[PDB]
Design an enzyme around this catalytic site. Structure first.
Site, short mmCIF file in Angstrom:
data_model
loop_
_atom_site.label_atom_id
_atom_site.label_comp_id
_atom_site.label_asym_id
_atom_site.label_seq_id
_atom_site.Cartn_x
_atom_site.Cartn_y
_atom_site.Cartn_z
N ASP A 33 -35.26 -11.60 3.48
CA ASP A 33 -35.55 -12.30 2.20
C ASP A 33 -34.88 -11.68 0.96
OD1 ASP A 33 -36.52 -14.90 2.51
OD2 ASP A 33 -38.63 -14.29 2.66
N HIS A 53 0.85 -1.22 0.00
CA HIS A 53 0.00 0.00 0.00
C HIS A 53 0.88 1.25 0.00
CE1 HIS A 53 -4.32 -1.36 1.37
NE2 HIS A 53 -4.10 -1.51 0.05
N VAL A 108 -48.60 -16.41 -5.18
CA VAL A 108 -48.97 -15.10 -5.81
C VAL A 108 -50.00 -15.33 -6.92
CG1 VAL A 108 -48.07 -13.11 -7.12
CG2 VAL A 108 -46.76 -14.04 -5.20
N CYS A 162 -14.31 6.18 6.94
CA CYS A 162 -13.08 5.42 7.28
C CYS A 162 -13.41 3.92 7.32
CB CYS A 162 -12.52 5.87 8.63
SG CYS A 162 -11.04 4.97 9.15
N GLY A 210 -46.18 -18.50 0.90
CA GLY A 210 -47.44 -18.15 0.21
C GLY A 210 -47.30 -18.14 -1.31
N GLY A 245 -47.23 -17.92 -9.20
CA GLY A 245 -46.26 -18.86 -8.61
C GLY A 245 -46.27 -18.85 -7.09
N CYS A 247 -6.07 -4.91 0.90
CA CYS A 247 -6.36 -4.59 -0.53
C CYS A 247 -7.07 -5.77 -1.20
CB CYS A 247 -5.07 -4.28 -1.28
SG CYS A 247 -5.31 -3.28 -2.77
N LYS A 282 -51.19 -12.45 -2.25
CA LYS A 282 -50.29 -13.51 -1.72
C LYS A 282 -51.01 -14.29 -0.62
CE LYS A 282 -45.44 -13.73 -1.75
NZ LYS A 282 -44.10 -13.75 -1.11
N1 AGS Z 1 -45.72 -7.77 -6.44
C1 AGS Z 1 -45.59 -8.55 -7.54
N2 AGS Z 1 -45.86 -8.07 -8.79
C2 AGS Z 1 -45.74 -8.84 -9.89
N3 AGS Z 1 -45.35 -10.12 -9.86
C3 AGS Z 1 -45.06 -10.73 -8.69
C4 AGS Z 1 -45.16 -9.96 -7.44
N4 AGS Z 1 -44.81 -10.80 -6.45
C5 AGS Z 1 -44.50 -12.00 -7.01
N5 AGS Z 1 -44.65 -11.95 -8.35
C6 AGS Z 1 -44.43 -13.04 -9.32
O1 AGS Z 1 -44.64 -14.31 -8.69
C7 AGS Z 1 -43.59 -15.24 -9.02
C8 AGS Z 1 -43.15 -16.02 -7.78
O2 AGS Z 1 -43.83 -15.53 -6.62
P1 AGS Z 1 -43.15 -15.48 -5.16
O3 AGS Z 1 -44.02 -16.27 -4.22
O4 AGS Z 1 -42.82 -14.04 -4.83
O5 AGS Z 1 -41.76 -16.28 -5.34
P2 AGS Z 1 -40.55 -16.08 -4.30
O6 AGS Z 1 -40.05 -14.67 -4.43
O7 AGS Z 1 -39.59 -17.23 -4.47
O8 AGS Z 1 -41.29 -16.25 -2.88
P3 AGS Z 1 -40.72 -15.56 -1.54
O9 AGS Z 1 -41.76 -15.64 -0.49
O10 AGS Z 1 -40.36 -14.02 -1.82
S1 AGS Z 1 -39.03 -16.58 -0.91
C9 AGS Z 1 -42.47 -14.43 -9.66
O11 AGS Z 1 -42.07 -15.03 -10.90
C10 AGS Z 1 -43.01 -13.03 -9.87
O12 AGS Z 1 -43.01 -12.66 -11.25
ZN ZN Z 2 -4.96 -1.49 -2.32
ZN ZN Z 3 -10.68 4.94 11.36
#
Ligand code: AGS
Ligand code: ZN
Ligand code: ZN
Ligand code: ADP
Ligand code: LCJ
Ligand code: MG
Lengths: 289, 229, 350, 229
Positions: free
Chosen positions: C188, C3, C83, C16, C81, C76, C48, C95
């Site tokens: 998450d 350094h 969606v 810092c 939960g 999905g 570094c 959800k």
């Molecule tokens: N607020 C939202 N708007 C549009 N699409 C959503 C939304 N939330 C989820 N999705 C869709 O739903 C699909 C999967 O749903 P999720 O349950 O959110 O999956 P995930 O994220 O693995 O679950 P968690 O609970 O976050 S670990 C995804 O491919 C998204 O496109």
């Molecule tokens: Zn360096």
């Molecule tokens: Zn310091």
């Protein structure tokens, strides 16, 4: 019956009932209307690139040639509506995981017939295809009212094993201590998993935690750093206690192989014993003979 | 046009040059038109950076002056360089207060803007207070005192206990009490009081200022933990 | 591998890299940019691969009833939960929380959590429009058009210019800093829970909601680890801590998102087993490999990623420091892409 | 007298003010005094930093000029401001080049110092090569081609290939080939030749020469890994 089944399509199936909930997949009893047969349709929802998905469906076609009395029959593997469909022979006795809860504990003389089926199942997969199961556990040993004991959910597709390894998280494990540390000893890990499965059902409890719940991490750390589980003394025959001990030696080389287990005192005795397994199974479940 | 001047000053600010920027923003204020919210922060940043560079120069030159501890022409020359950069420091601060008390403070419609310009005025009088040692100290110390008291009355009256400007005033006025007047008891009381009231309306934190609010908050806590030792 | 330091008076906002307070004047390594104090120089080594106290820096019932949410197409399932694209004064995301039978004790804590999530309004945060108790539990968030970050980085594998890549990482830290400013643990954070709104604005979703994860048995909420572990901090994997979900657990998860965007691949792309990752990561044996990065990534930028992935959680920086560091090189990005030149020599001494 | 002005130059270096150091060292070399190691090294630091700061600012201004072309005459004032930067960039560099013709080149009684001053001449022609376009660039680049060609010879015959001045010479001449003439294969070979020779003769250095050499060769490895891909 398999020759009556041409190409499998989603609209050719009719839903009957769900066989049971899973960690990653869901299984339904379905009627293939063109053939008029009751199959067990497993649907796996994987968010993967189509190139990997197409390879998974390609490596599952390997199951068409996995035909034996200790391997769950296979009808076809296709992709539709963002889900991988694996259509296989319906086993009306369910998994030994389901039969275990219904039985409380499984008798030693019954586990003798299961051990022979699992050993010969693992032998077939490794001799005729040379594929390590890598998932031996009570939930993946299927039984029917005819008295057949068949292995399922074995690693014929290496691309499918990597796919679900990224997607889901398990709470119960049967992985060998050497595999957990990244050491590969062929089918020695599958024999560990069998021995752990045999202790679970016989005791009527889980092998990993011994009274004489834990998170997945605490379970894996225990398998690696603690002595392996063993059958309770007195209530099981010395041959059966020695069989599971040789199956649960943490050293994968000192651990008995498939050839060594086939001629073990427990297997040679159980192979000779006349056990009405089909009669016991239907009696345990509540079915009719 | 004003927009060509503010784009020129903003462009010069992106280039890390604080001579053309300060000249451009002096040329803006010389027009004698009232600034926006946006155009003001640029002016404060320019005339904070210019004094800041000379402050760092003064501190390290004064540390070398207290480091040498001999008897030679190095100490006389370092004193000549100190009075040079000190006079340069004086010229900048006098240009600021000349540009501030003639176009902006007497023509300040927004009371928020009045707290801002009086905070700046007290800041630059503290900047002249720390360097000028003698009889002239007692003038600018009392001038900064009046300026901060004037700002503190309007802060206590018509400001939020979670507004960036009231928190900045409380911070500058607390460090004024510690460094210039050396009464850490009233600085401790003041900073603790300002920090407590700052806790009350923690729920009332909109997106406009979360970073500034929590940044002055953790700086207030760091100053407290230094002074309670 | 040495350094070389320079006297540098930071004109912008900088912290810092031992004490992590506001830095005004001090030293900078002309290799990396591991800027640090002069005061706490005798406590921190090189890495570094009575003083003037600071002053003012520079300035730059929420329950939806039945007959209102037109539940549309199944999208999905998640880790707590599923969606569905619902209609509710425009397109929303419903959800159905895996917890269908919550106890009057869990239900109360959920209503309390929703209270905080409903009082969140940031450009980089998905809007939380309450929930619904008649048809079980169903969190209703702002419906995202376009697609998720996970979809754009590992599905179509459409890599974007480092300028656009860094920008996504900046806006994520911006939204994440807001959540930690309001003392909200995400629990998450992953590319799956980050959407690119009309291809520009980063929208972080599925944050907080600690009480609808890890089903209760009465008045407790032992977080039974579930979902996905590629983003989980080693302290979170163990679950041995009373609480593994801290800011640093979220900062680690953020560091995994940095890795995803930087290399275009998800961490540990050489293991065909999940349990192996859970064990080895939680044991501090497996770490995301930093040898698969691009051959133009500055040491200053890359180092930030390495700081967030620290096995011990107390070593990881916080988001006010991260966002400052991300932004710091976003400005020195184009100038530093050009070829290196002759440096100024040692000009330092301690 | 001299030691007082070198003390002032050091004091200016510690105080971060560089225009004072540039003037304070130009007035010392203006006399024609015997220039030792440290005395020419402070001059090298001064005239590096002062042009370097304006060069980075020009890089930022030129980048911001080309951000959006689908726009109004806001770019008009920018590229005239860029010319303002060029007006305070070329003539200050000329202030260094005339100096090399005044004292440095004729008053050199050691080849090592001649390689050093010829490297500085070529480096300041290299900085002028960037902003200067058209037929000027051709005229500018031709002065460096002979400058580094009259230093490499001495570097090879009078100093070891592990010498940091010869390493810096190969490094600056490598970036000259890459950025200006755009012959990256010749740049890659030259470096590889310079680096392999350095490895071929290692562990013979002085105790002091265990920081600067390593840093240059380490930057050489950085250029080579950057230029392979
Ligand atoms: N607020 C939202 N708007 C549009 N699409 C959503 C939304 N939330 C989820 N999705 C869709 O739903 C699909 C999967 O749903 P999720 O349950 O959110 O999956 P995930 O994220 O693995 O679950 P968690 O609970 O976050 S670990 C995804 O491919 C998204 O496109
Ligand atoms: Zn360096
Ligand atoms: Zn310091
Ligand atoms: N052919 C089958 N016949 C009956 N039940 C089956 C069949 N295949 C799978 N199942 C059931 O499907 C469920 C899901 O299995 P799976 O998703 O592979 O995970 P696991 O076996 O670990 O539960 C299990 O409970 C199993 O009993
Ligand atoms: O079943 C699996 N895992 O459990 C589901 C969790 O989602 C599984 C796992 C790995 C695998 C590799 N090749 C197929 N594989 C599986 N499937 C499968 C295998 C054999 C038969 I016969 C029927 C099947 F469905
Ligand atoms: Mg199964």
């Amino acid at each position: 019956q398999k020759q009556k089944v041409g190409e499998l399509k989603d609209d050719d199936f009719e839903k009957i009932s769900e066989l049971g909930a899973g960690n990653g997949g869901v299984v339904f009893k379905v009627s293939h209307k063109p053939s008029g047969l009751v199959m067990a349709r497993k649907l796996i929802h994987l968010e993967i690139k189509p190139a990997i998905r197409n390879q998974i469906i390609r490596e599952l076609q390997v199951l068409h040639e996995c035909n034996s009395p200790y391997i769950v029959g296979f009808y076809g593997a296709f992709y539709s509506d963002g889900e991988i469909s694996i259509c296989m022979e319906h086993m009306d006795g369910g998994s030994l995981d389901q039969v275990l809860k219904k039985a409380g504990r499984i008798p030693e003389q019954i586990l003798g017939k299961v051990s022979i089926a699992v050993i010969k199942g693992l032998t077939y997969l490794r001799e005729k295809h040379k594929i390590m199961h890598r998932d031996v556990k009570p939930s993946n040993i299927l039984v029917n009212s005819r008295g057949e004991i068949k292995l399922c959910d074995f690693g014929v597709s290496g691309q499918l094993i990597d796919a679900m390894a990224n997607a889901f998280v398990g709470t119960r494990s049967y992985m060998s201590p050497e595999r957990l540390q990244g050491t590969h000893y062929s089918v020695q890990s599958d024999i560990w998993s069998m021995g752990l499965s045999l202790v679970e059902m016989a005791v009527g409890r889980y092998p990993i935690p011994p009274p004489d719940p834990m998170a997945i991490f605490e379970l894996l750390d225990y398998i690696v750093n603690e002595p392996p589980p063993k059958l309770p003394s007195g209530v099981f025959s010395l041959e059966f206690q020695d069989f599971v001990n040789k199956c649960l030696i943490k050293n994968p080389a000192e651990r008995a192989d498939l050839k060594q287990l086939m001629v073990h005192a427990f297997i040679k005795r159980s192979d000779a014993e006349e056990v009405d397994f089909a009669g016991w199974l239907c009696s345990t479940i509540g079915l009719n003979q | 046009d004003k927009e060509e001047l503010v784009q020129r000053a903003k462009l010069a600010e992106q280039a890390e040059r604080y001579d053309d920027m300060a000249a451009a923003m002096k040329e803006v204020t010389e027009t004698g038109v009232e600034l926006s919210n946006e155009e003001r922060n640029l002016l404060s940043v320019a005339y904070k950076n210019v004094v800041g560079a000379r402050r760092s120069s003064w501190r390290v030159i004064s540390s070398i002056e207290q480091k040498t501890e001999g008897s030679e022409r190095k100490q006389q020359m370092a004193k000549e360089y100190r009075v040079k950069v000190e006079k340069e420091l004086r010229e900048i601060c006098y240009d600021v207060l000349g540009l501030l008390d003639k176009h902006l403070i007497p023509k300040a419609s927004n009371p928020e803007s009045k707290v801002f310009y009086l905070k700046m005025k007290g800041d630059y009088y503290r900047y002249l207070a720390e360097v000028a040692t003698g009889e002239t100290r007692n003038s600018v110390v009392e001038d900064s005192q009046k300026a901060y008291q004037d700002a503190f009355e309007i802060s206590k009256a018509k400001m939020q206990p979670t507004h960036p400007i009231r928190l900045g005033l409380a911070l500058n006025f607390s460090v004024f009490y510690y460094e210039i007047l050396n009464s850490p008891d009233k600085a401790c009381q003041l900073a603790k009081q300002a920090f407590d009231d700052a806790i009350a309306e923690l729920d009332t934190l909109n997106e406009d200022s979360y970073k500034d609010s929590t940044l002055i908050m953790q700086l207030l806590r760091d100053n407290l933990t230094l002074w309670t030792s | 591998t040495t350094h070389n330091f320079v006297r540098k008076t930071f004109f912008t906002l900088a912290f810092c890299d031992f004490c992590r307070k506001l830095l005004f004047q001090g030293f900078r390594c002309q290799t990396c940019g591991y800027k640090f104090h002069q005061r706490c120089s005798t406590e921190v080594p090189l890495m570094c691969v009575r003083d003037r106290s600071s002053s003012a820096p520079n300035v730059h019932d929420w329950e939806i009833p039945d007959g209102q949410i037109t539940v549309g197409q199944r999208i999905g399932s998640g880790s707590f939960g599923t969606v569905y694209k619902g209609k509710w004064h425009g397109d929303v995301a419903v959800k159905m929380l895996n917890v269908t039978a919550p106890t009057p004790q869990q239900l109360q804590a959920f209503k309390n959590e929703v209270g905080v999530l409903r009082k969140t309004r940031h450009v980089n945060i998905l809007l939380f429009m309450g929930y619904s108790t008649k048809p079980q539990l169903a969190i209703v968030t702002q419906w995202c058009e376009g697609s998720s970050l996970y979809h754009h980085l590992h599905i179509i594998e459409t890599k974007f210019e480092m300028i656009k890549l860094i920008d996504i990482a900046r806006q994520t830290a911006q939204g994440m800093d807001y959540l930690h400013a309001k003392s909200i643990i995400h629990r998450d954070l992953k590319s799956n829970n980050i959407f690119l709104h009309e291809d520009l604005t980063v929208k972080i979703g599925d944050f907080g909601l600690a009480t609808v994860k890890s089903r209760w048995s009465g008045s407790h909420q032992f977080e039974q680890l579930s979902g996905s572990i590629l983003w989980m901090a080693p302290e979170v994997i163990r679950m041995q801590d009373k609480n593994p979900y801290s800011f640093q657990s979220d900062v680690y998860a953020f560091g995994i998102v940095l890795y995803e965007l930087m290399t275009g691949q998800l961490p540990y792309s050489n293991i065909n087993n999940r349990d192996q990752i859970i064990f080895m990561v939680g044991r501090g044996y497996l770490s995301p490999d930093l040898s698969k990065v691009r051959s133009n990534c500055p040491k200053a930028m890359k180092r930030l990623m390495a700081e967030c992935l620290k096995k011990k959680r107390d070593e990881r920086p916080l988001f006010p420091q991260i966002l400052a560091s991300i932004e710091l090189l976003a400005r020195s990005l184009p100038k530093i892409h050009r070829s290196a030149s002759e440096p100024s020599l040692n000009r330092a001494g301690f």
